[PDB]
């Protein structure tokens, strides 16, 4: 995307829905990506701004774009506790079991940081509870290791 692309990435990161609107109106590439594979939808899902995410998706943003670390927008949305964003990404065909370089999935991330309601919606869309990461840890194991009580129980019930 060059000049406008870099600006779009910055607007997405900073959660500037207006700037994003203006940049896209000036021909900014919705699927622009920097050297690390980071796209506007990644930074938008990280910014926690819903309107921008919905805007990027409507312009043809790829929901399952992976960065160099194997992170999709869904990974960032879950990790940063943006429930509404997680729901929109999944609604737009996000891979719920997307796995990063270290075998981490959105469920692992949501389970790690106590995002109960995000764990629920993820499980609702078929999140794999028996998915082991590079350390052999399941999302349940992460819930236990981080003292997340209510989430460890839900993941247990789901497993059984």
């Amino acid at each position: 995307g060059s000049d406008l692309g870099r600006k779009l990435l910055e607007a997405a990161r900073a959660g500037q829905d207006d700037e994003c609107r203006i940049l896209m109106a000036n021909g900014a590439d919705v699927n622009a990506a920097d050297n690390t594979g980071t796209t506007p939808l990644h930074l938008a899902a990280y910014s926690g701004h819903l309107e921008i995410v919905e805007c990027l998706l409507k312009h043809g943003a790829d929901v399952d774009a992976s960065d160099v670390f194997g992170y999709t927008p869904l990974h960032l949305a879950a990790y940063w506790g943006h429930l509404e964003i997680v729901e929109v990404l999944l609604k737009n065909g996000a891979d719920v079991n997307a796995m990063d370089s270290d075998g981490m999935t959105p469920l692992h991330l949501a389970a790690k940081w106590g995002y109960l309601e995000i764990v629920e919606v993820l499980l609702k869309h078929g999140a794999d509870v028996n998915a082991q990461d590079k350390f052999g840890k399941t999302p349940f194991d992460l819930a236990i290791d981080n003292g997340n009580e209510d989430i460890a129980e839900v993941l247990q019930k789901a497993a059984k």
């Binding site: 960065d67 670390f69 990790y79 940063w80």
Partner: protein
């Protein structure tokens, strides 16, 4: 007595101690600060010339000693105890002491007391802290991620190390770059970047600019940076680095040391100037007045300097840090690890891949 000390140190103050000696002994004392003296010394000392005493960071002296440029110093048992134990570990080559420790420097955690009155005691809680601050349009932590010197504190916390040290001797072959300790630390660092708590392109100027204008709650830096933060008028504090996996961060320690030239006929005479005229409360203050030494190796005077919490923090982190190997092979370490961290941070290589290369590149084995 001819002495060489860098121009950025308080050489005028050291010269006052020189005036004292002369007036208290007779022998004249000249204090010079030639351009690029750390490179000039090994060339001029190889011809049997140079100064009687050389002041420079200890890390350089191991190369000097290896070429027999430095006379072995013989501090009595009583003198050893006047200085902090670990400082002597920085002036040994092949188990023998080749220099007197003068001052000590190490990285500390610098924080904005208005944005973060309660600085983190652990690395593990920074992600949560950054999440809270990002709501306010700010970040928890920004520091130079381009140089191993700045990222090693974390990488080494859980058992990483440059070269194995014991009995004043480094093992060129025992490198602790790709051990479980190093991989755990760098993985945590990369995860901070992967989750966007930090940016892989953050360098010295970017981190400095961000902290001094109140955009980030924390940074990592040394005493040299304080002066720029004072001018920014940010209400900052300097404190112990966060722990990782219950382990203290291990910053590299730089120890301004004074060596005696092997070609000097005034060995025992230089010993009296350093032990009884420079390494005292009076001697160190005379120098500190001209240009702050920061933390010092002399217990008595350090305890007075430590009334400044920033200096107290510097010493605390130094005591918990890793003395910078003073051996030439350290050039290989800097070179290899610098590439490994930048590559792991950018995803160009995985942690395991990056540190394996660094282990080999530093001269070690997997």
């Amino acid at each position: 007595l001819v002495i060489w000390i860098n121009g950025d140190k308080g050489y005028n103050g050291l010269a006052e101690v020189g005036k004292k000696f002369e007036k208290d002994t007779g022998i004249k004392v000249t204090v010079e600060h030639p351009d690029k003296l750390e490179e000039k010394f090994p060339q001029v000392a190889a011809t049997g010339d140079g100064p009687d005493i050389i002041f420079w960071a200890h890390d350089r002296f191991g190369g000097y000693a290896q070429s027999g440029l430095l006379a072995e110093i013989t501090p009595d048992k009583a003198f050893q105890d006047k200085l902090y134990p670990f400082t002597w570990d920085a002036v040994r080559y092949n188990g023998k002491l080749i220099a007197y420790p003068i001052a000590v420097e190490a990285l500390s955690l610098i924080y904005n007391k208005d944005l973060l009155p309660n600085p983190p005691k652990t690395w593990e809680e920074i992600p949560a802290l950054d999440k809270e601050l990002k709501a306010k349009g700010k970040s928890a932590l920004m520091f130079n991620l381009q140089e191993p010197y700045f990222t090693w504190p974390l990488i080494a916390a859980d058992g990483g190390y440059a070269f194995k040290y014991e009995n004043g001797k480094y093992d060129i072959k025992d490198v602790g770059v790709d051990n479980a300790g190093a991989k755990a630390g760098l993985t945590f660092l990369v995860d901070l970047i992967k989750n966007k708590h930090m940016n892989a392109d953050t360098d010295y100027s970017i981190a400095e600019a961000a902290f001094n204008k109140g955009e980030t709650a924390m940074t990592i830096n040394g005493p040299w940076a304080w002066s720029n933060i004072d001018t920014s008028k940010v209400n900052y504090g300097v404190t112990v680095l966060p722990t990782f996996k219950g382990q203290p961060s291990k910053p590299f320690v730089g120890v301004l040391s004074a060596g005696i030239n092997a070609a000097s006929p005034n060995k025992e005479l230089a010993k009296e100037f350093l032990e009884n005229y420079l390494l005292t409360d009076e001697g160190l203050e005379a120098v500190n007045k001209d240009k702050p030494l920061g933390a010092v190796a002399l217990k008595s005077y350090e305890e007075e300097l430590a009334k400044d919490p920033r200096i107290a923090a510097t010493m605390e982190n130094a005591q918990k840090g890793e003395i910078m190997p003073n051996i030439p092979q350290m050039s290989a370490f800097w070179y290899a690890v610098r590439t490994a961290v930048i590559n792991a941070a950018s995803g160009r290589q995985t942690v395991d891949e990056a540190l394996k290369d660094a282990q080999t590149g530093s001269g070690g084995t997997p």
